[PDB]
Amino acid sequence: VWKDADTTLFCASDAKAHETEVHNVWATHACVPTDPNPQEIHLENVTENFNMWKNNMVEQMQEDVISLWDQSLQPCVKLTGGSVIKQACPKISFDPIPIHYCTPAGYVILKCNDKNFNGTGPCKNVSSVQCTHGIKPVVSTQLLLNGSLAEEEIIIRSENLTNNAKTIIVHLNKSVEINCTRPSNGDIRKAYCEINGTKWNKVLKQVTEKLKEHFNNKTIIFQPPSGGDLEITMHSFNCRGEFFYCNTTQLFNNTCINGTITLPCKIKQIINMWQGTGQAMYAPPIDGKINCVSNITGILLTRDGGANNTSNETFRPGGGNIKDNWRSELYKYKVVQIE
Ligand SMILES: N=C(N)N[C@@H]1Cc2ccccc2[C@H]1NC(=O)C(=O)Nc1ccc(Cl)c(F)c1
Ligand SMILES: *[C@@H]1O[C@H](CO)[C@@H](O)[C@H](O)[C@H]1NC(C)=O
Ligand SMILES: *[C@@H]1O[C@H](CO)[C@@H](O)[C@H](O)[C@H]1NC(C)=O
Ligand SMILES: *[C@@H]1O[C@H](CO)[C@@H](O)[C@H](O)[C@H]1NC(C)=O
Ligand SMILES: *[C@@H]1O[C@H](CO)[C@@H](O)[C@H](O)[C@H]1NC(C)=O
Ligand SMILES: *[C@@H]1O[C@H](CO)[C@@H](O)[C@H](O)[C@H]1NC(C)=O
Ligand SMILES: *[C@@H]1O[C@H](CO)[C@@H](O)[C@H](O)[C@H]1NC(C)=O
Ligand SMILES: *[C@@H]1O[C@H](CO)[C@@H](O)[C@H](O)[C@H]1NC(C)=O
Ligand SMILES: *[C@@H]1O[C@H](CO)[C@@H](O)[C@H](O)[C@H]1NC(C)=O
Ligand SMILES: *[C@@H]1O[C@H](CO)[C@@H](O)[C@H](O)[C@H]1NC(C)=O
Ligand SMILES: *[C@@H]1O[C@H](CO)[C@@H](O)[C@H](O)[C@H]1NC(C)=O
Ligand SMILES: *[C@@H]1O[C@H](CO)[C@@H](O)[C@H](O)[C@H]1NC(C)=O
């Protein structure tokens, strides 16, 4: 017998104590080693309700990642409420590692194993676990990187699809590689990303067909974002400590929906902090080749309003709430207290 409850979670990881990489350092001091033989119990005849959009596990992960970045990735100047903070901004070793979230005694984590679970409502195939799977704390907008893939069909997630103000999370069932590079040898902030156009356009066509099922077979249209902060209008992410901002106009070009697509990118020092603490200037990029190859496993979308009297629905890449990134991985888990 159990009931829905929130409690203090702890973390587990396979971090190395001898690593200078910042995720390793944080996890060494903030997490315990992983269980080599974890137990999972599949529950029979058990129906449980989940709600990925109201899940305290997400708030707790957010607190961890904020703490990690605060101790690791420090900007040269910080612009809060008018209180300017100047500090050292050393270049670091940066590469996210999987973090597991675990319940203490008296509690357990229920896991939804339904193949086409959208994140809310009843789940039929439920199991109980001690810890989540390993989740990499990848901070990004527009595209979700290095995550897990949907097991069967592409999944559309939203707290309320009818509400255009609510962010849509697209969970891909097939990853697409994105290859981003700041070449060695001169604009030190000029970079680019390479993507297989045949792979991407095929996947995007499938996303269109899935969106049709949720929007009464209306015509599905992709468009680049219309105004807003750079973090939202561009695909922003962190590669080896450096903030990349990439133009994704070529990715959301309803025309193609086959060669190599090259997105123009820029390394930015002055950014709007995802933590929500204002503007900050980080250190200039390191020398040499800066490269990150990532799997696109999800897309963050925002639907246009004002289209109720037409046969079209328009979607633009979005983001800005990093909690949605954690939701995209934590959707199938909830904490319950054992009586
Ligand atoms: N939606 C907006 N225009 N701003 C939102 C609004 C809001 C509310 C609460 C906390 C934050 C934020 C803003 N979000 C950000 O500044 C942001 O996500 N920045 C950012 C910077 C770097 C990278 Cl690599 C990245 F992935 C994201
Ligand atoms: C529930 O579990 C059974 C047995 O593994 C599986 O055949 C079925 O597809 C599952 N149902 C859903 C909704 O995934
Ligand atoms: C990239 O995608 C491939 C294919 O799914 C996967 O095997 C690999 O682990 C992914 N790399 C990651 C998660 O960084
Ligand atoms: C991904 O899901 C779609 C349905 O949304 C399905 O048609 C397609 O076969 C799936 N792709 C893979 C690789 O399983
Ligand atoms: C998810 O499933 C629930 C229960 O069937 C349903 O009410 C809701 O509309 C679904 N959400 C999405 C995004 O399809
Ligand atoms: C979903 O959004 C629509 C449009 O804003 C709203 O009318 C409706 O009440 C919402 N549904 C729920 C269950 O909140
Ligand atoms: C990434 O792109 C560069 C050229 O831009 C190439 O040398 C490298 O092999 C690519 N990496 C992968 C994994 O394809
Ligand atoms: C791009 O992806 C397709 C599959 O969609 C693959 O057959 C092709 O080899 C890829 N192109 C390159 C240059 O690797
Ligand atoms: C979309 O089209 C299919 C047939 O191609 C139909 O079965 C389905 O009901 C349609 N969905 C709608 C109209 O919402
Ligand atoms: C992205 O590139 C396109 C094509 O050059 C340009 O029209 C658009 O303004 C760019 N978007 C942003 C947000 O810079
Ligand atoms: C859309 O793709 C086509 C490919 O022929 C290109 O000509 C056009 O300029 C693209 N539009 C963009 C990138 O906004
Ligand atoms: C995604 O994972 C790969 C493999 O670990 C890594 O090399 C790459 O830097 C990651 N991308 C991001 C944005 O963290």
d(CA 213, CA 89): 49
Resolution of the coordinates, Å: 1.8
d(CA 190, CA 206): 32
**Tokens matching residue 290:** 């800066």
Distance 192 CA to ligand 6 centre (A): 40
d(CA 106, CA 103): 8
Residue 206 beta carbon below 6 angstroms from any ligand 4 atom = yes
SS (H, E, C) 18-47: CCCCHHHHHHHHHCEECCCCCCEEECCCCC
d(CA 60, CA 62): 5
Q: What is the largest CA-CA distance in the chain?
A: 65
The strand pairing partners of 99, in sequence order, are 135
Atom of ligand 2 nearest to the CA of 115: 14
d(CA 308, CA 314): 11
**Tokens matching residue 122:** 């009843």
**Tokens matching residue 23:** 């995720």
CATH architecture of 1-339: Beta Complex (2.170)
PDB experimental method: X-ray
Residue 67 beta carbon below 6 angstroms from any ligand 6 atom = no
Ligand 9 probe mutation, 208, 216, 217, 313, most atoms within 8 A of CB: 217
Q: Which class for 56: exposed (0-12), middle (13-18), buried (19 or more C-beta within 10 A)?
A: middle
Cα distance between the two ends of the chain: 6
Distance 238 CA to ligand 7 centre (A): 18
